[PDB]
Amino acid sequence: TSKVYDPEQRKRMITGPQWWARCKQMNVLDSFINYYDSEKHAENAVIFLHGNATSSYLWRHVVPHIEPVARCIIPDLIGMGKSGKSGNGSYRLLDHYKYLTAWFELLNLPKKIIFVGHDFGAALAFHYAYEHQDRIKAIVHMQSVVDVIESWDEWPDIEEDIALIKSEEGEKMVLENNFFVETVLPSKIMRKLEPEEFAAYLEPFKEKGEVRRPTLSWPREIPLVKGGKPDVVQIVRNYNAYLRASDDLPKLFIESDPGFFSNAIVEGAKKFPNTEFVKVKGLHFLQEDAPDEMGKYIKSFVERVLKNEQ
Ligand SMILES: O=C(Cc1ccc(O)cc1)Nc1ncc(-c2ccc(O)cc2)nc1Cc1ccccc1
């Protein structure tokens, strides 16, 4: 089976260099963060968090829809995109969280922040919210790490694949063969990316070896109760319980159709009260198939949240 280019994409296409020229770099702890900042309307802040294999580039066609209503800030996570590397070479969830929260404290953020999370980027937003429950205005999430994996009731039995990624054979798949960037990323986009678009995802991880570590450390953080990292499992248990009780926190979930393990994620997402559910066509990286529909849904949601707090 093959995929085809979107014939109208090249006229709107934003290349890697075009995106990176719109970004800025700032020191954060012992390293630095590359990020996009739309600057205007700073009384609110909408922070977009990518997950594994991607970078701020993922949001490039989504964010213009929201910039007119609120300041939009989009980082490259540490070790990813054009950001600096982690000082100790470690890329666990808490390593990312350490750099991400240090970056927040330098951005002049409002008291209450809006988060937009994908993949493990949503796990970071959820953990931040659990630890700063008075700093959260709204949360948008999608194809997200919503809860632990405790059984195969909703999740397909992925045990054999998890054992693979945790093995030395999985390490070679990532560090030598770039599995998540070269294979998973295009497999989980419906359209075919333009060559320049794939090149922007490939560029941080173009060289073999240890530079690819973040794309191996992320799946090894999976919150599988039996065999997962117990510190990550606890983080996810804690913020899941918080989210299930957060009746007063308005949320938006963008379902992807047919998505990627969608059923398990939706069933977890349904347990969080005050969630508006919308749906777009896509797989895992739904930003690359329905960015304008997503941007419009997010814009209306933010507008509604702002109008009803006032
Ligand atoms: O890594 C995870 C973590 C997770 C996600 C959601 C959740 O409720 C609990 C834990 N899941 C995962 N589990 C399996 C695979 C996977 C499976 C097969 C394959 O060929 C490639 C990747 N990928 C992933 C990455 C992923 C999927 C969906 C949403 C976020 C992150």
Residue numbers in the entry: 2 to 311
Paper text:
The light-producing reaction catalysed by the Renilla-type luciferase is one of the most widely used biochemical reactions in molecular and cell biology research. Here we track the role of dynamics in evolution, starting from the evolvable and thermostable ancestral protein AncHLD-RLuc which catalyses both dehalogenase and luciferase reactions. The regions encompassing the L9-α4 fragment and L14 loop are important structural elements that line the main access tunnels connecting the buried active site to the surrounding solvent. We conclude that the LUC activity benefits from conformational dynamics of the protein’s rigid scaffold to allow binding of a bulky substrate.
To ascertain the role of the L9-α4 fragment in substrate binding, we tried to co-crystallize RLuc8 with CTZ. In contrast, mixing the RLuc8-W121F/E144Q mutant with CTZ yielded a high-resolution complex structure with coelenteramide (CEI), which is the product of the LUC reaction. Unlike in an RLuc8-CEI complex structure, the CEI molecule in our complex is inverted by nearly 180°, which allows its accommodation in the luciferase active site cavity. The rest of the CEI molecule occupies the main enzyme access tunnel, where it is tightly wrapped by multiple, predominantly hydrophobic, residues: V146, I150, I159, V185, F181, F261, F262, H285 and I266. Interestingly, many of the residues directly interacting with the CEI are located on the loop L9 (V146, I150, W156 and I159) and the loop L14 (I223 and P224), identified as important for catalysis by our directed evolution experiments. The α4 helix is in an open conformation relative to the α5 helix.
